Design a protein around this ligand. Sequence first.
Ligand SMILES: [Ca+2]
Ligand SMILES: [Ca+2]
Length: 415
Amino acid sequence: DQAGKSPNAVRYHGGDEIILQGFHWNVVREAPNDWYNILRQQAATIAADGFSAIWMPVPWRDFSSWSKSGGGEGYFWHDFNKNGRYGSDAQLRQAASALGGAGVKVLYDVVPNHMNRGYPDKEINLPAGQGFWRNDCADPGNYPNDCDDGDRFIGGDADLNTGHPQVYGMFRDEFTNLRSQYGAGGFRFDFVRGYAPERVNSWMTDSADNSFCVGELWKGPSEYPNWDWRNTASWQQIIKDWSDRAKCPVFDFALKERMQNGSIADWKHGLNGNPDPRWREVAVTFVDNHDTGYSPGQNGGQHHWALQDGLIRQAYAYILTSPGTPVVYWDHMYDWGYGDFIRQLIQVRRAAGVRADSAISFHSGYSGLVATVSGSQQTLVVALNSDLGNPGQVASGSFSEAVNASNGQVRVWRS
Ligand SMILES: [Ca+2]
Ligand SMILES: [Ca+2]
C-alpha cells in the first residue's frame, strides 16, 4: 500500500485504496453482539480477497429502538462506550488488530451530527442552555441556525452544536482515541450535510491528518435554496465542493444518481469520470450501502435507493475498473453470490494498476458504456451492455480478454 495526500492535499491515502463496507444494515439483528468476532475471523479472507481497507460500523454504542423497525445500528448512539450491539470493547480491539494485522486499515464510521440525547443512561450528558445543542437556538427550519452551521437530522432536537468548543473537542479526543487504541486508519463521516465541511478538515488535521477519510454528503441540488448556486449545480459540483473544504474524499453520489436514474452510458457523468484528475481522484465510488441498498434479514434492509438487480455485475465491473476509490458492499461480496466475480475484478484492477487519478475516456459511438482506463501497469477497455465488437475499435495496442461474463454484457480487455 501507499500513503499520501492528493496534489490538492485531499486525504485519499495514496489513491490506491480498495474498500470493503464491513457490514450491512441488519447486522445487530442477524448476528447479535457477534459482528466483531465475525470480522476478526474473516480478516484473513478479507485481505486475501484484495481489500486494502474496511469501513467499520459506528463503534459508539446505540441502544435506540423504533417502530418497519430498527435501532442500535450506531447512527443514534448515546455515548462513546464501545460495548454496543456489534460486540464488546475487547472484541473491537481484537478485530481491529487482526484486520490491521492482515494489511487491512480500519476506517471508523463516525456520527458527529447528533446523538441519542434522550437516552437515560449514558456517559455523555450535555445540558440545555449552554449552546451545546442546535435547538438551544431558534430553529425555524432545516438549514443552519446560530447553534448549528449545518442541516438538521429530521426534527433537529438531537442535533449537536459541533461548532461549540467543548463538543468539537470531545469528538476530536475520541477520534484521537480511536486512532490511538482502536487501530483506526481513517474515518468515514456520516451525514456531512449536518455540519461544516471545514470542521471535518479540522478533526482530521487534529487527530489523523495523514489518514484516509471519506464523507457522505447525500443532498440533491433541489434541496438547496434557489439563491444558492448549488440549487442549479450538478450532483458532481456539490460533492466536489464539500471535498474541497473538508480536504477529504467524498462518496460519489453523482455516479450513484446516474446509476439510479440514467442509462448505463450516462454513468460517465459520475464524479469519478471527470476529465480533471483533481475531480475524479476524490470520488469514492460504490454500488449500494446499508442505506441505499438491501440487507439480509428484516424487511430486506432499508433499500432507500437500491440498484436495479440486473445491473449489479455491470456496476461492480465499472467502479472496480475506473478512477476514484471503490467500495464493495458486504452483502454482494459475502451473502449474495457476487464474491467470485468481484474477486476477479479486484485482481484486474490491481494488475492494471488503476488508481483514483487514472485517466478515463468514454466512447459514445457504441451502445452501452464503453471506456478506456489508463492504469499505471496496463490499459483497460471496458464494455458494459455494449455492442462493441473488439477493443481495437476504440484503442491502439495489444489487448487480451480480462473479463467476459453475462453473455458478453460485461467485457474487459487488458494490454
Ligand atoms: Ca493507500
Ligand atoms: Ca446539524
